[PDB]
Design a protein around this ligand. Structure first.
Ligand SMILES: C=CCCN1C(=O)[C@@H](C)N(C2CCOCC2)c2nc(Nc3ccc(C(=O)NC4CCN(C)CC4)cc3OC)ccc21
Length: 128
């Protein structure tokens, strides 16, 4: 009915909270960075992204499939390599946040693939 996206965004939020925010030493990427303590971030990094704004984006039902969801989560690893270098421990930790979020999205792959058809057929049909 009208629970397709509510369910979808529920499964995503649980990935963030119980598989990504649980990566060891993912302390830094949980919240947005304060610009008074990092004097260059918000102008070297044009598109900031943290896991708190991803959840607040999830609760707004913004991700209608993993492609738009993976876009945002891939951006915090792209942001740490563009600010800390590809070999920094921060970047290495962001690589594992992205990694745990990839096995988990294909560990629930089929079941997720069906919700994506359901949500969009509703948006297809609503137009036609
Ligand atoms: C989107 C994700 C952005 C992820 N991200 C980055 O991508 C970049 C911007 N960083 C950098 C900033 C520069 O340091 C390397 C990490 C982040 N920093 C922090 N925050 C802190 C880092 C280190 C310390 C510290 O060690 N404190 C010291 C303790 C000991 N006393 C004597 C001195 C202070 C504290 C932090 O918050 C309070 C948070 C996030 C980042």
């Amino acid at each position: 009915m009208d629970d397709d996206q509510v369910a979808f965004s529920f499964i995503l939020d649980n990935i963030v909270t119980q598989k990504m925010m649980a990566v060891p030493d993912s302390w830094p990427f949980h919240h947005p960075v304060n610009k008074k303590f990092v004097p260059d971030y918000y102008k070297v990094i044009v598109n900031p992204m943290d896991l708190e704004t991803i959840r607040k984006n999830i609760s707004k039902h913004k991700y209608q499939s993993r492609e738009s969801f993976l876009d945002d989560v891939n951006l915090i690893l792209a942001n740490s390599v563009k600010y800390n270098g590809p070999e920094s421990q921060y970047t290495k930790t962001a690589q594992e946040i992205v990694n745990v979020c990839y096995q988990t999205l294909t560990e629930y792959d089929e079941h997720l693939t069906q919700l994506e058809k359901d949500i969009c057929t509703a948006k297809e049909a609503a137009l036609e």
